[PDB]
Amino acid sequence: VQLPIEAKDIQKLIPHRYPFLQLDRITAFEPMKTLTAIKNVSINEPQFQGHFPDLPVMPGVLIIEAMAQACGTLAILSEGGRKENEFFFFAGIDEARFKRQVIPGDQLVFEVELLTSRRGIGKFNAVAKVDGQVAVEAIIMCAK
Amino acid sequence: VQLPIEAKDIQKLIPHRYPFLQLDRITAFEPMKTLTAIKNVSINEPQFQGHFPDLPVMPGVLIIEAMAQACGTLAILSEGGRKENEFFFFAGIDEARFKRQVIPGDQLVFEVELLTSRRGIGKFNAVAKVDGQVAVEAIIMCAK
Amino acid sequence: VQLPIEAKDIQKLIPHRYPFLQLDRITAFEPMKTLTAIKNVSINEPQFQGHFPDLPVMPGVLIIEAMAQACGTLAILSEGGRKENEFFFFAGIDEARFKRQVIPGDQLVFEVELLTSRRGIGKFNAVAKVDGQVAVEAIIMCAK
Amino acid sequence: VQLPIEAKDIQKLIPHRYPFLQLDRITAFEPMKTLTAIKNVSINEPQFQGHFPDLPVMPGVLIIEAMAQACGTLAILSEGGRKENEFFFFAGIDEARFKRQVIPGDQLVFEVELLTSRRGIGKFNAVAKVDGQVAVEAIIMCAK
Amino acid sequence: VQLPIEAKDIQKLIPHRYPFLQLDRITAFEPMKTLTAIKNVSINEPQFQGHFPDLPVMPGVLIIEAMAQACGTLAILSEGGRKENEFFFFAGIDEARFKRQVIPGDQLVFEVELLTSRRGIGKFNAVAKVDGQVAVEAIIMCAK
Amino acid sequence: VQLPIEAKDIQKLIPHRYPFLQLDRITAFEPMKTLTAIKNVSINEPQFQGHFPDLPVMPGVLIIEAMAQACGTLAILSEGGRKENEFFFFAGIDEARFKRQVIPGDQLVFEVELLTSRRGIGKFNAVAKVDGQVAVEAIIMCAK
């Protein structure tokens, strides 16, 4: 697979579309092992009308959603799949901590790792950094 | 406090606004203990443009966000507070399981419970039901 | 036909899409006679940015539009039709009364009835209830 | 009062905001009698994402809503009122006929007339024209 | 070609969609020479949430974008092309002056003219009028 | 002034709001001379629903708008002004070339310079880079 995977091509892999596509670009990929993706945070995003009116703060849950989407794409790429034939459900979130406020101008770097794969259910470790510092970390479960 | 607390009044309690206000109404409240809230799921919501284009599925993370908002309002109401004083951060998610697809037409009923309050950090149990069945359950941490 | 008809399948019947699809689910249907549909009202809907800024109130005209859509789907289902082969125009509204404020958290229940079918023009009676109380009633004309 | 009343000033008269402000400009006004207003129809309006995906057609109910807003502003201007003191409810619609498809590029001209004012309830005749042809006509009731 | 070209058909010619389709209707056309198009400005457009919060002012750059789209369609129509085969890039803007505030209620009339076509790069003169007065004028370059 | 200036504070300087605030952060500033600002490009931005449906491409005109906003803020900061105080109009664009496609994932770096200030009219040179490469360059005029 050709890196980086641009947003236009992430869309060929997963069905998510605006305003629920929370990855901009896949930058690293080791089959069945790891993936790096980014999401640029901009004040021109729909969530910032309401979160919060004069104080833009990237919602943690959207960072979580990006983490899950990264995990899902890692899985999909690993079996050479596409959006038309395969779906991985978001099954659970495990040890999610929100450590840093993320704001417009920040580039989120997501690093995810496949830990265990018992019976179509994948357990992943996922972290989201801004400028090297951890902003959110969590364990993410996906189910085929 | 006068029940039900309508959306217009939820907004006097928390700063969240469209499209990140994910409670429609508070229906039950026991100070320092429990709260029930609802969120109506409709096809006329912004997330359903992209999640997913022909197949509307309420994103789990938005159900999580609602659960967190319910926990936070339970806390706020318990110290008779408002949106303009100080704030409860979303600190973590613990044991979140996504058990049922939620779809337009479903009314989400959120029941949350304050478990422990060890030094500014509140640990809550939260469940989200549709028609009596559990759709999502999770432990939610908020920090003052 | 299999009830309830979910939003995803309402979209196979009528061309309306976000933000102008104002039915969430079809719950009852008697061919050439009656139909029940619901629409969940949530603060997370686009109209509530502007109607009104701090006071969410479901616009009557959108309740009217839902009524018309329910009438139209009753008609379509009655001739086993689809969205791709022909269209029922909204021809007129006759004795529309707005009796109750509808607000986030309310579930609108729409009950519509085919009265007469003189000359490709269908005259319907339509009512919209919240919790058993009438909120809006009207006569709706559709033309094939 | 100074004519034309621009959108910026229509907003000082009525509480409606995006996406539910359906008048662009007030062009004529006779106290307690008549008003003319316009609404420009553009493909760059939020309703045209869904109404309909490849076939932009101005929803009749929004034309109705504009008619009602024109009536309401006629009333407000007639008692020299503002958005912060007075509210006129939309009470009913009477003899509404949808005669012409309205499309992007059309400028809607609204001409409304106060017929009767029995006990705080105002009955108005309203027509909406494009290029001189009637597109929608209706009787509009507002209540103080 | 059949005039006027309505928005529904402009979309068969160029790929631009909501909220970046800034032409409502093509009204005049001389192959390889000139084109007239209109864009209705309405308070019900997404840019007016932010530009500016209580003071709606049509952004100059969107007028520029419309001018470019008009130039592009003039080119496309001139080689009988469509959106699925041929595309013209926006290459530059030359002598753009913003002379008049444009506001809701204004109808923008765009008149564009092909000046030179040296080697796939088309240089156009473009003006945008409201009620005959120039609001914006510019030279627009497109590249095949 | 304290650098970086975050989006929340850019808003105290200029009246632009969603979806027409096209700067995320001010990173450099020399009074009456230069300014650097960034804008993160994400697939989660409103323009990418329509520009273009399956092929996200940052519109050149929005890059232009950002360049102008950067120029304007340079000016505002230089006379210690604010948004409630006064306003710099966008007066013209001079020698604008679009050299590179900008896509989700790209961070735009804007570097602007005050050239001349002949009587309330400021002439600026402006460039927008992604990863060191020029994407757009232009001369920007603002008028007080």
From Swiss-Prot, chains A, B, C, D, E, F:
Broad EC category: lyase
Q: Which GO terms describe its cellular component?
A: cytoplasm; membrane
Mind giving the lineage of the organism this protein is from?
A: Bacteria, Pseudomonadati, Pseudomonadota, Betaproteobacteria, Neisseriales
Q: InterPro entries from the entry?
A: FabA_FabZ, FabZ, HotDog_dom_sf
- What are the UniProt keywords, alphabetically? Cytoplasm, Lipid A biosynthesis, Lipid biosynthesis, Lipid metabolism, Lyase
Q: Where is the active site?
A: 51
- What Enzyme Commission number(s) does the record list for this chain? 4.2.1.59
Q: Which NCBIfam families match?
A: fabZ, PRK00006.1
- Which segment of the chain is annotated as a signal peptide? none
Q: Which SUPFAM superfamilies match?
A: Thioesterase/thiol ester dehydrase-isomerase (SSF54637)
Q: Show the catalytic activity.
A: a (3R)-hydroxyacyl-[ACP] = a (2E)-enoyl-[ACP] + H2O
Please state where this protein is localized: Cytoplasm
Provide any one GO MF term from the record.
Answer: (3R)-hydroxyacyl-[acyl-carrier-protein] dehydratase activity
Its name, as the record gives it, is 3-hydroxyacyl-[acyl-carrier-protein] dehydratase FabZ
Q: What does this protein do?
A: Involved in unsaturated fatty acids biosynthesis. Catalyzes the dehydration of short chain beta-hydroxyacyl-ACPs and long chain saturated and unsaturated beta-hydroxyacyl-ACPs.
Instruction: Please list the GO biological process terms of this entry.
Output: fatty acid biosynthetic process; lipid A biosynthetic process
**Homology family:** Belongs to the thioester dehydratase family. FabZ subfamily.
Species annotation: Neisseria meningitidis serogroup C / serotype 2a (strain ATCC 700532 / DSM 15464 / FAM18)
Q: Looking at the keywords, is Lyase present?
A: yes
Task: State if DNA repair is listed as a keyword.
Answer: no
